[PDB]
């Protein structure tokens with residue numbers, strides 16, 4: 352039995368959780384109650400398998416068990432139409448069908464949070480149904496969310512209430528801690544969506560290369576043979592979590608933490624504090640540990656990679672191991688380089704040996720390879736340096752609006768809601784990275800953009816409208832950012848045409864938070880730039896300055912939300928003028 356295997360390792364608690372997460376990630380539209388029922392019916396079965404390892408279908412693979420269970424409610428097309436098809440399938444891929452149907456943008460209603468007085472009560476009354484709901488809402492809204500880590504967010508989510516409800520001012524103690532978690536959860540989720548996308552669309556060799564470079568950065572003193580071992584396991588873990596095998600992912604992940612702590616001295620000296628605490632915390636600790644100090648006397652790369660005479664020979668024997676070594680050797684002594692820049696140089700190195708080794712004289716051909724690295728390294732540095740100066744000037748908000756206009760001009764087809772989200776996140780890079788020394792600015796900024804741009808790619812892949820986004824997204828993982836910065840403005844885009852609904856103005860906007868108020872303005876700018884791509888300089892501002900006047904006036908005007916209509920039609924006249 353397999354279901355028995357995972358049960359003994361994870362135990363009732365985590366086992367019940369992980370399966371809830373899995374069920375939620377598959378049927379995101381299914382109600383909380385039904386999931387709970389299935390989870391139990393499923394957990395009860397497991398209990399019998401432990402004793403009798405052959406009872407009913409205890410000999411089954413999780414895929415068959417889980418699949419059939421869900422298919423007892425999926426067949427209801429009136430609720431989950433396209434789903435029933437999945438259930439009529441067989442073993443080889445009745446699952447590939449499900450995975451294929453995960454929604455990265457579920458049409459699930461917003462998740463508002465009741466007063467601090469109810470949450471605490473509901474928390475204290477029933478502590479298990481409260482937390483179960485949490486995971487349910489997060490896993491169903493983040494189908495790729497790193498499960499093992501979602502159990503970590505749960506432990507803190509609980510600790511938040513456990514303490515705050517016992518305060519003098521619960522609303523003061525909770526709120527903050529809850530906001531902080533709302534953000535970190537999103538960050539951790541996107542960061543992970545990039546991992547599942549890599550593996551799934553580019554293959555595991557691409558994921559491995561990324562890992563090798565990142566680990567070689569964190570663990571400089573770690574030997575290549577050791578890192579490889581870590582990369583091999585690591586891949587496997589994530590390969591599983593992404594395919595939907597949460598249980599084994601959660602299991603294997605623990606094993607890896609166990610290992611990394613056992614062989615602490617061979618990997619990094621910054622793992623201490625991490626290995627002296629609870630599993631879940633220990634795991635989330637290692638995965639976020641700072642780079643170890645750089646080894647003292649380190650030879651020069653050129654020695655074994657451009658000057659040696661056996662380069663090509665070695666490359667032919669086992670290129671994959673050779674290029675892997677190069678990356679490792681270049682990453683370890685360069686924690687000031689983003690991971691995508693390292694994978695670029697590496698790719699430039701390979702392409703070079705390829706054409707060079709089939710020449711009349713290699714050493715002469717590949718002798719000036721480093722000469723080509725300069726341009727690649729410079730580029731990010733400049734972009735970052737420039738985009739940080741601007742950010743400082745304008746501040747976050749103003750900087751976001753800059754990126755809004757710019758990107759909408761690049762890819763006007765893209766949906767307003769998506770451009771608004773991406774551009775805002777893109778703006779977050781300033782407050783996040785610009786306050787860092789050049790030595791840590793590149794890794795922070797560029798690698799972050801890789802996550803933000805991946806969001807744009809997956810979202811866009813649902814309904815492809817811009818072939819330009821498509822190419823930059825599919826052509827090369829490592830080059831996505833330079834690919835986008837290259838794009839200027841679409842010269843084939845035909846400006847949209849105005850219509851009342853191009854934007855509705857109902858007063859309901861005077862109640863929304865300050866945030867959703869900015870958002871509404873930005874969503875406007877996007878719609879403006881879509882209508883008038885070309886004619887655009889300062890007239891946009893002049894217009895956006897007017898848009899603000901409109902809201903303030905009719906939100907403050909005692910008269911019903913009407914002046915927003917009269918003066919709203921008045922402002923439209925002025926707007927068109929510019």
Ligand SMILES: CCCCC1C(=O)N(c2ccccc2)N(c2ccccc2)C1=O
Pocket residue numbers: 497500539543566569581585588604605607608633634635637638639
């Ligand atoms: C929220 C996503 C986390 C991804 C991640 C992971 O699961 N492991 C990880 C897995 C188990 C225990 C500790 C960390 N490490 C990791 C980092 C460097 C070297 C090896 C592993 C990670 O960065």
